[PDB]
Design a protein around this motif. Structure first.
Motif, PDB file in Angstrom:
ATOM      1  N   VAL A  75       0.824  -1.197   0.000  1.00 41.54           N
ATOM      2  CA  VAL A  75       0.000   0.000   0.000  1.00 41.54           C
ATOM      3  C   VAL A  75       0.882   1.282   0.000  1.00 41.54           C
ATOM      4  CG1 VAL A  75      -1.608   1.388   1.333  1.00 41.54           C
ATOM      5  CG2 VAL A  75      -2.100  -1.028   0.870  1.00 41.54           C
ATOM      6  N   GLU A  76       1.860   1.319   0.883  1.00 38.83           N
ATOM      7  CA  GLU A  76       2.778   2.465   0.976  1.00 38.83           C
ATOM      8  C   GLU A  76       3.472   2.825  -0.366  1.00 38.83           C
ATOM      9  OE1 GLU A  76       5.907   1.494   3.729  1.00 38.83           O
ATOM     10  OE2 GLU A  76       6.682   3.546   3.820  1.00 38.83           O
ATOM     11  N   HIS A  77       3.793   1.819  -1.170  1.00 41.17           N
ATOM     12  CA  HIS A  77       4.494   2.028  -2.425  1.00 41.17           C
ATOM     13  C   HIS A  77       3.601   1.870  -3.644  1.00 41.17           C
ATOM     14  CE1 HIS A  77       8.529   2.363  -0.883  1.00 41.17           C
ATOM     15  NE2 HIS A  77       8.147   1.501   0.045  1.00 41.17           N
ATOM     16  N   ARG A  78       2.298   1.959  -3.415  1.00 40.98           N
ATOM     17  CA  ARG A  78       1.323   1.865  -4.460  1.00 40.98           C
ATOM     18  C   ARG A  78       1.649   2.912  -5.533  1.00 40.98           C
ATOM     19  NH1 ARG A  78      -4.001   1.176  -1.852  1.00 40.98           N
ATOM     20  NH2 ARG A  78      -3.885  -0.758  -3.084  1.00 40.98           N
ATOM     21  N   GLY A  79       1.603   2.499  -6.791  1.00 39.38           N
ATOM     22  CA  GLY A  79       1.922   3.410  -7.869  1.00 39.38           C
ATOM     23  C   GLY A  79       3.358   3.354  -8.313  1.00 39.38           C
ATOM     24  N   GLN A  80       4.264   2.854  -7.484  1.00 40.18           N
ATOM     25  CA  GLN A  80       5.691   2.857  -7.817  1.00 40.18           C
ATOM     26  C   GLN A  80       6.232   1.546  -8.346  1.00 40.18           C
ATOM     27  OE1 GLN A  80       8.147   5.023  -4.876  1.00 40.18           O
ATOM     28  NE2 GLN A  80       6.311   4.943  -3.580  1.00 40.18           N
ATOM     29  N   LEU A  81       5.405   0.525  -8.458  1.00 45.54           N
ATOM     30  CA  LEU A  81       5.895  -0.780  -8.835  1.00 45.54           C
ATOM     31  C   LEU A  81       4.960  -1.393  -9.871  1.00 45.54           C
ATOM     32  CD1 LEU A  81       6.903  -2.266  -5.343  1.00 45.54           C
ATOM     33  CD2 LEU A  81       8.468  -1.551  -7.136  1.00 45.54           C
ATOM     34  N   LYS A  82       5.541  -1.995 -10.876  1.00 45.59           N
ATOM     35  CA  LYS A  82       4.771  -2.588 -11.945  1.00 45.59           C
ATOM     36  C   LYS A  82       4.451  -4.055 -11.625  1.00 45.59           C
ATOM     37  CE  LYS A  82       7.112  -0.984 -16.223  1.00 45.59           C
ATOM     38  NZ  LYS A  82       6.571   0.067 -17.115  1.00 45.59           N
ATOM     39  N   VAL A  83       5.015  -4.608 -10.559  1.00 45.68           N
ATOM     40  CA  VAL A  83       4.810  -6.007 -10.247  1.00 45.68           C
ATOM     41  C   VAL A  83       3.294  -6.313 -10.149  1.00 45.68           C
ATOM     42  CG1 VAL A  83       5.039  -5.660  -7.775  1.00 45.68           C
ATOM     43  CG2 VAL A  83       5.511  -7.868  -8.713  1.00 45.68           C
ATOM     44  N   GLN A  84       2.851  -7.443 -10.705  1.00 39.86           N
ATOM     45  CA  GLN A  84       1.467  -7.822 -10.553  1.00 39.86           C
ATOM     46  C   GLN A  84       1.358  -8.783  -9.385  1.00 39.86           C
ATOM     47  OE1 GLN A  84      -0.265  -9.154 -14.522  1.00 39.86           O
ATOM     48  NE2 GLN A  84       1.936  -9.293 -14.983  1.00 39.86           N
ATOM     49  N   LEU A  85       0.637  -8.409  -8.357  1.00 41.46           N
ATOM     50  CA  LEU A  85       0.514  -9.225  -7.172  1.00 41.46           C
ATOM     51  C   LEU A  85      -0.495 -10.270  -7.423  1.00 41.46           C
ATOM     52  CD1 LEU A  85       0.656  -6.541  -4.381  1.00 41.46           C
ATOM     53  CD2 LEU A  85       2.437  -7.995  -5.280  1.00 41.46           C
ATOM     54  N   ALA A  86      -0.241 -11.483  -6.963  1.00 39.36           N
ATOM     55  CA  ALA A  86      -1.232 -12.501  -7.012  1.00 39.36           C
ATOM     56  C   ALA A  86      -1.256 -13.198  -5.687  1.00 39.36           C
ATOM     57  CB  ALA A  86      -0.914 -13.473  -8.139  1.00 39.36           C
ATOM     58  N   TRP A  87      -2.454 -13.527  -5.221  1.00 42.42           N
ATOM     59  CA  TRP A  87      -2.660 -14.076  -3.893  1.00 42.42           C
ATOM     60  C   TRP A  87      -3.630 -15.290  -3.888  1.00 42.42           C
ATOM     61  CZ3 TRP A  87      -0.395 -11.093   0.208  1.00 42.42           C
ATOM     62  CH2 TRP A  87      -0.024  -9.791  -0.118  1.00 42.42           C
ATOM     63  N   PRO A  88      -3.100 -16.496  -4.015  1.00 43.32           N
ATOM     64  CA  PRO A  88      -4.004 -17.615  -4.021  1.00 43.32           C
ATOM     65  C   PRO A  88      -4.703 -17.803  -2.681  1.00 43.32           C
ATOM     66  CG  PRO A  88      -1.764 -18.359  -3.786  1.00 43.32           C
ATOM     67  CD  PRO A  88      -1.703 -16.919  -4.166  1.00 43.32           C
ATOM     68  N   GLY A  89      -5.967 -18.214  -2.729  1.00 40.90           N
ATOM     69  CA  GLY A  89      -6.729 -18.564  -1.547  1.00 40.90           C
ATOM     70  C   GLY A  89      -6.513 -20.008  -1.144  1.00 40.90           C
ATOM     71  N   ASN A  90      -7.579 -20.617  -0.668  1.00 38.86           N
ATOM     72  CA  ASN A  90      -7.523 -21.988  -0.181  1.00 38.86           C
ATOM     73  C   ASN A  90      -7.632 -22.983  -1.320  1.00 38.86           C
ATOM     74  OD1 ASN A  90      -9.547 -20.523   2.220  1.00 38.86           O
ATOM     75  ND2 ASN A  90      -7.507 -21.208   2.733  1.00 38.86           N
ATOM     76  N   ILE A  91      -6.545 -23.209  -2.017  1.00 39.45           N
ATOM     77  CA  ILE A  91      -6.648 -23.997  -3.198  1.00 39.45           C
ATOM     78  C   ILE A  91      -6.142 -25.430  -3.041  1.00 39.45           C
ATOM     79  CG2 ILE A  91      -6.578 -21.941  -4.582  1.00 39.45           C
ATOM     80  CD1 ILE A  91      -3.701 -22.631  -5.316  1.00 39.45           C
ATOM     81  N   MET A  92      -5.473 -25.726  -1.935  1.00 36.86           N
ATOM     82  CA  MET A  92      -4.718 -26.950  -1.860  1.00 36.86           C
ATOM     83  C   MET A  92      -5.600 -28.209  -1.828  1.00 36.86           C
ATOM     84  SD  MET A  92      -1.889 -25.969  -2.526  1.00 36.86           S
ATOM     85  CE  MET A  92      -1.118 -27.560  -2.509  1.00 36.86           C
ATOM     86  N   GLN A  93      -6.831 -28.148  -1.314  1.00 40.31           N
ATOM     87  CA  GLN A  93      -7.711 -29.317  -1.435  1.00 40.31           C
ATOM     88  C   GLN A  93      -7.997 -29.686  -2.897  1.00 40.31           C
ATOM     89  OE1 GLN A  93     -11.423 -26.735   0.195  1.00 40.31           O
ATOM     90  NE2 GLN A  93     -12.035 -28.680  -0.774  1.00 40.31           N
ATOM     91  N   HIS A  94      -7.928 -28.714  -3.810  1.00 40.68           N
ATOM     92  CA  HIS A  94      -8.183 -28.999  -5.211  1.00 40.68           C
ATOM     93  C   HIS A  94      -6.918 -29.507  -5.852  1.00 40.68           C
ATOM     94  CE1 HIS A  94     -12.057 -27.242  -4.450  1.00 40.68           C
ATOM     95  NE2 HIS A  94     -11.446 -26.192  -3.938  1.00 40.68           N
ATOM     96  N   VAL A  95      -5.829 -28.818  -5.638  1.00 40.12           N
ATOM     97  CA  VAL A  95      -4.574 -29.236  -6.231  1.00 40.12           C
ATOM     98  C   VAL A  95      -4.208 -30.642  -5.740  1.00 40.12           C
ATOM     99  CG1 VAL A  95      -2.120 -28.689  -6.410  1.00 40.12           C
ATOM    100  CG2 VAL A  95      -3.755 -26.888  -6.572  1.00 40.12           C
ATOM    101  N   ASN A  96      -4.382 -30.934  -4.452  1.00 40.98           N
ATOM    102  CA  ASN A  96      -4.086 -32.259  -3.918  1.00 40.98           C
ATOM    103  C   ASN A  96      -4.875 -33.358  -4.607  1.00 40.98           C
ATOM    104  OD1 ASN A  96      -2.425 -31.005  -2.071  1.00 40.98           O
ATOM    105  ND2 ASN A  96      -3.735 -31.416  -0.332  1.00 40.98           N
TER     106      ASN A  96
END
Ligand SMILES: CC(=O)N[C@@H]1[C@@H](O)[C@H](O[C@@H]2O[C@H](CO)[C@H](O)[C@H](O[C@]3(C(=O)O)C[C@H](O)[C@@H](NC(C)=O)[C@H]([C@H](O)[C@H](O)CO)O3)[C@H]2O)[C@@H](COS(=O)(=O)O)O[C@H]1O
Ligand SMILES: CC(=O)N[C@@H]1[C@@H](O)[C@H](O[C@@H]2O[C@H](CO)[C@H](O)[C@H](O[C@]3(C(=O)O)C[C@H](O)[C@@H](NC(C)=O)[C@H]([C@H](O)[C@H](O)CO)O3)[C@H]2O)[C@@H](COS(=O)(=O)O)O[C@H]1O
Ligand SMILES: CC(=O)N[C@@H]1[C@@H](O)[C@@H](F)[C@@](OP(=O)(O)OC[C@H]2O[C@@H](n3ccc(N)nc3=O)[C@H](O)[C@@H]2O)(C(=O)O)O[C@H]1[C@H](O)[C@H](O)CO
Ligand SMILES: CC(=O)N[C@@H]1[C@@H](O)[C@@H](F)[C@@](OP(=O)(O)OC[C@H]2O[C@@H](n3ccc(N)nc3=O)[C@H](O)[C@@H]2O)(C(=O)O)O[C@H]1[C@H](O)[C@H](O)CO
Ligand SMILES: *[C@@H]1O[C@H](CO[C@@H]2O[C@@H](C)[C@@H](O)[C@@H](O)[C@@H]2O)[C@@H](O[C@@H]2O[C@H](CO)[C@@H](O)[C@H](O)[C@H]2NC(C)=O)[C@H](O)[C@H]1NC(C)=O
Ligand SMILES: *[C@@H]1O[C@H](CO)[C@@H](O[C@@H]2O[C@H](CO)[C@@H](O)[C@H](O)[C@H]2NC(C)=O)[C@H](O)[C@H]1NC(C)=O
Ligand SMILES: *[C@@H]1O[C@H](CO)[C@@H](O[C@@H]2O[C@H](CO)[C@@H](O)[C@H](O)[C@H]2NC(C)=O)[C@H](O)[C@H]1NC(C)=O
Ligand SMILES: *[C@@H]1O[C@H](CO)[C@@H](O[C@@H]2O[C@H](CO)[C@@H](O)[C@H](O)[C@H]2NC(C)=O)[C@H](O)[C@H]1NC(C)=O
Ligand SMILES: *[C@@H]1O[C@H](CO)[C@@H](O[C@@H]2O[C@H](CO)[C@@H](O)[C@H](O)[C@H]2NC(C)=O)[C@H](O)[C@H]1NC(C)=O
Ligand SMILES: *[C@@H]1O[C@H](CO)[C@@H](O)[C@H](O)[C@H]1NC(C)=O
Ligand SMILES: *[C@@H]1O[C@H](CO)[C@@H](O)[C@H](O)[C@H]1NC(C)=O
Ligand SMILES: *[C@@H]1O[C@H](CO)[C@@H](O)[C@H](O)[C@H]1NC(C)=O
Lengths: 286, 277
Positions: free
Chosen positions: B176-197
Motif C-alpha cells: 500500500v505504501e508504495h502503491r503506484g511505484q511498482l509494476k509487479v502484478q501481485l497474485a494471492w491464491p486462496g484456499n486452493i490446496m484441497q483442489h490441487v491435492n
C-alpha cells in the motif's frame, strides 16, 4: 502524610517546562501524514514504521486529556504489594484511576479496585496474552477484555521499541475491523521519551528506560491536583512481614521475583512522598 | 528427450478437471469481502485472517494469467544442481519463466538465467532475508528487488499456514505504501490446496504439503504448451561429478522427484539434471 499542594504544583510546572504533556499524551490525526515513517525511542535510527491510512484513522482528533482536570488521581502500578491490601475502595474513590499494561482488576477488586479511566498497553501484551489475535478465541478474548474497559482510555506506546512493529499492525487491523463496536478511547503517544527523560534527568534519575509507572506519574501531574500512588514497590519482600512477594499482584502466589532501575525510581518517589508531593501507599488500606 | 504433446494435453485436461487453474491462481477483489475471515489450508480451522480494506485493494481485478498462452515455459526450482550448469541461456530462451521463492538471479545469471515472468513468495522469505522490513535498508533492498522484477507476477501464498498472518500485514502495508511505484502484478491464491491435492492424489503422491515447484508445474500446465523443469533435484550429491551439493543454488520431496522423473520419461515434461553446457 500531609499533601503539600504548593510543592506539587511547583513539580507540575517543572514537568511542563520539559514536557508538553497534553500534546505528548497522544499523536492526533493532524500531527501525522499518511505514509510517514516513525522511528523508535529506544532503538537504533535505522528501525522505522510507516503510518498507514488505517493507523491514522485510529488516532484521536484532539488530545484526550485536553481541558481535563481531575482532583484526586490514583496511579496504580502492578506490584505484589497490593495483594491483601484492601485498597480497592480507596482507589475507586479517586476521580481518575490510571492502570498499567492492561492489568486485571475483576479478579482482584478488593485489593486494586474496579475503576479504570486509563490503562496502558505495552504492545508485547498482545503477543504474551492474546497470541497476536491469531485465532478466533484470542480475538474473542481480547474483544471481551476491551468491552469491559467501557469508555476508558487505552494508552498504547507503539513507538518506543522496534519489536512493537508487528503487534501494532495486528492492533490497527483489529480496531479498524471492530470500529463502532467499542467505546474505548485509543491514545497513541509518539516519540516522547527524549522529553520525559529531560525532567527526570534533573532529579538524578536516568536509566536505560523509565518505567510505565513513572511515565504515568509524569502525565498525571499535568491533569491531577493530587496523585496517590499504589502498587509501586519493586522489591520481592513485603516491607512489613518480609514474606516473599511476587513482582506482580496477579502472579500466582508463590512466583519468585534489564533496562529499568526500578529501585532508583522507587527511592525517588519515596523521597517525593516525604516532601508531600505525592502519597505512596506501602501498607494495607484496611 | 522427445515431447509427447498428446500425453501432455491429456494431462492438462486432467488437471483442469480438478483445478480451475486460472481462478485458483489468485483471489481477486470481488471474490472476498472486507471483514471476511480466511482460514489456512494446513492449519486448524481456529486460525483466521480478517480481510482488511488494504489487503483487498492489493488483490488483482482479474486473474493475471487469464488468456495468457505461452509456448515454452521454464519452471526453475532452487536445487544446487543448477550451480555450474550453465543453463541460463536455455532458460532465458523460454517464452515464460517461473521461479520459486524470490530466488536471486543477478549473481547467478550464467546458470539460472535473468528472465523472470513469475516468482513465488513464501511469506517466510520476508522474515528470513528482509528482516520483516524493520529497517530502512531492508525496505530499500526489498524495494529494489521488486523494481527489478519489472512487470512480472509475484505469487504470494498467504493462506496455507497461519504463521504467514503477521508477515502478510507487513507486506500489505509495504505494498500500500508504495502503491503506484511498482509494476509487479501481485497474485494471492486462496484456499486452493484441497483442489490441487486431488489431481496429485491420483498420481499416488500425497505428502503433508506439496512443494512450490509442483504447484508451479500444476499452474504452468494451463498456460504453457510445453514445460521444461530446471533446479529439481532434492539430493545432496551431484549426479554427474558426485560432489556434495547444497540444497539451494544460492547457498516428501523424493516422492515428488520420482513422480517428475516419471513424467519426464513419459514425455510430459523435460527434467534437466545435467549441465546445459
Ligand atoms: C530475544 C531477546 O531476549 N531479546 C531481547 C529483547 O526482546 C528485549 O526487548 C523487549 O522485548 C519485549 C518482548 O518480549 C518487548 O518487545 C519490549 O518492548 C516493549 C514492550 O512491548 O513490552 C516496548 C514498550 O514500548 C516498552 N514500554 C515502555 C517503555 O513504557 C516496554 C518496556 O520498556 C519493557 O516491557 C520493560 O519493562 O518494552 C522490548 O523492549 C530486550 C530487553 O530490554 S527491555 O528490558 O525490554 O528494555 O533485550 C533483548 O535482548
Ligand atoms: C516451532 C517449530 O519449529 N515448528 C515448526 C515450524 O517451524 C514449521 O512451520 C513452517 O514454519 C515456517 C517458519 O519459517 C514457515 O512459516 C512455514 O510457512 C510456509 C512459509 O512461509 O515458508 C508457508 C507457505 O505458505 C508454504 N508454502 C507453500 C505450501 O507453497 C511453506 C511451505 O510449506 C514450505 O516448505 C515451508 O517453507 O511454508 C510454516 O509451515 C512447521 C511446519 O513445517 S514445514 O514448513 O512443513 O516443514 O513445523 C513445525 O515443526
Ligand atoms: C515480564 C516483565 O518484564 N515485566 C515488565 C516490567 O519489567 C515492568 F517494568 C513494566 O510494567 P509493569 O510490570 O506492568 O508494572 C507497572 C508499573 O508498576 C511499577 N511496579 C511494578 C511492579 C512492582 N513490583 N513494583 C513497581 O513499582 C513500575 O512502575 C511498573 O512500570 C513496564 O513497562 O515498566 O512492564 C512489564 C510488562 O511489559 C507488562 O506488564 C506486560 O504485561
Ligand atoms: C527451510 C525452508 O523453509 N525451505 C523451504 C522448502 O522446504 C521448500 F519446501 C520451499 O521451496 P524451495 O526450497 O525454495 O525450492 C523451490 C522448489 O525447488 C524444488 N527443489 C528445491 C531444492 C532442491 N534441491 N531440489 C528441488 O527439487 C522444490 O520443488 C521446491 O518446491 C517450498 O515451498 O517448496 O520453500 C522453502 C522456503 O520457503 C524458501 O526457500 C524461503 O526462501
Ligand atoms: C479536591 O480534593 C481535596 C482533598 O480532598 C481530601 O482528600 C482527598 C484525598 C479525599 O480524602 C477527600 O475526601 C478529602 O476531603 C478537597 O479539599 C478538601 O475539601 C473538603 C470539602 O470542603 C474539606 O472538608 C477539606 O478540609 C479539604 N481538605 C484539604 C486537604 O484541602 C477538595 O474539596 C476537592 N475539591 C473538589 C472540587 O473536588
Ligand atoms: C512545602 O514544600 C516546599 C518545597 O521544598 C517548601 O517550600 C520552601 O521551604 C523552604 C524551607 O526553608 C524555603 O527555602 C522556601 O522559602 C519555601 N518555599 C516557599 C514557596 O515558601 C515548604 O516549606 C513546604 N510546606 C510545608 C507545610 O511543609
Ligand atoms: C472513571 O471510570 C469509571 C469506570 O471504571 C467511571 O465510573 C463508571 O461510570 C459509569 C457511567 O456513569 C457507571 O455506570 C459506573 O457505575 C461507574 N463505574 C465505577 C466502577 O465506578 C467513571 O465515571 C470514570 N471517571 C471519569 C472519566 O472521570
Ligand atoms: C479452485 O478451483 C475449484 C474448481 O476446480 C473450485 O471449486 C469449485 O467451486 C464451485 C463454486 O464454488 C463449486 O460449485 C464446485 O463444485 C467446485 N469444484 C470442485 C471440484 O469442488 C474452487 O472454488 C476454486 N477456489 C478458489 C479459491 O479459486
Ligand atoms: C518475461 O519477462 C522478461 C523480463 O525478465 C521480459 O523480457 C524483457 O522485456 C523487455 C520489454 O519487452 C525488454 O526490453 C527486455 O530486454 C527483456 N528482458 C529479458 C531478460 O529478456 C519478457 O517479455 C517477458 N515475457 C513475457 C512473455 O511476458
Ligand atoms: C512533546 O513535547 C515537546 C514540548 O515539550 C514538543 O516540541 C514535541 O513535539 C512533543 N512531542 C510529541 C507530542 O510527540
Ligand atoms: C504418448 O502418450 C499417450 C498417453 O499415454 C499414449 O497413448 C501414446 O501412445 C504415446 N505416444 C508416443 C510415446 O509416441
Ligand atoms: C514452440 O517452440 C518450438 C521450438 O523452437 C517451435 O519449433 C514451435 O513451432 C513453437 N511455437 C508454437 C506456436 O508452438
Amino acid at each position: 502524610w500531609k499533601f503539600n499542594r504548593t510543592a506539587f504544583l511547583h513539580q507540575r510546572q517543572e514537568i511542563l517546562q520539559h514536557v508538553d504533556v497534553i500534546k505528548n499524551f497522544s499523536l492526533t490525526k493532524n500531527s501525522v501524514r499518511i505514509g510517514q515513517l516513525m522511528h523508535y525511542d529506544y532503538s537504533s535510527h535505522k528501525y522505522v514504521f510507516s503510518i498507514s491510512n488505517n493507523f491514522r484513522s485510529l488516532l484521536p482528533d484532539v488530545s484526550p486529556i485536553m481541558n481535563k482536570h481531575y482532583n484526586i488521581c490514583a496511579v496504580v502500578g502492578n506490584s505484589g504489594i497490593l495483594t491483601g491490601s484492601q485498597c480497592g475502595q480507596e482507589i475507586d474513590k479517586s476521580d481518575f484511576v490510571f492502570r498499567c499494561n492492561f492489568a486485571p482488576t475483576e479478579a482482584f477488586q478488593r485489593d486494586v479496585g474496579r475503576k479504570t479511566n486509563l490503562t496502558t498497553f505495552n504492545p508485547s501484551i498482545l503477543e504474551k496474552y492474546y497470541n497476536n489475535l491469531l485465532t478466533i478465541q484470542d480475538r474473542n478474548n481480547f474483544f471481551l477484555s476491551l468491552k469491559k474497559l467501557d469508555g476508558a482510555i487505552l494508552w498504547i506506546p507503539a513507538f518506543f521499541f522496534h519489536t512493537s512493529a508487528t503487534v501494532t499492525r495486528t492492533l490497527v487491523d483489529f480496531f479498524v475491523e471492530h470500529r463502532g463496536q467499542l467505546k474505548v478511547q485509543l491514545a497513541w503517544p509518539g516519540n516522547i521519551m527524549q522529553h520525559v527523560n529531560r525532567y527526570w534527568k534533573n532529579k538524578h534519575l536516568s536509566p536505560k528506560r523509565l518505567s510505565t509507572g513513572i511515565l504515568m506519574y509524569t502525565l498525571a501531574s499535568a491533569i491531577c491536583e493530587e496523585i496517590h500512588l499504589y502498587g509501586f514497590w519493586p522489591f520481592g519482600f513485603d516491607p512489613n512481614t518480609r514474606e516473599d512477594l511476587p513482582y506482580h499482584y496477579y502472579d500466582k502466589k508463590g512466583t519468585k521475583f534489564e533496562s529499568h532501575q526500578l529501585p532508583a525510581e522507587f527511592q525517588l518517589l519515596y523521597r517525593m512522598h516525604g516532601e508531600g508531593l505525592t502519597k505512596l501507599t506501602l501498607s494495607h488500606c484496611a
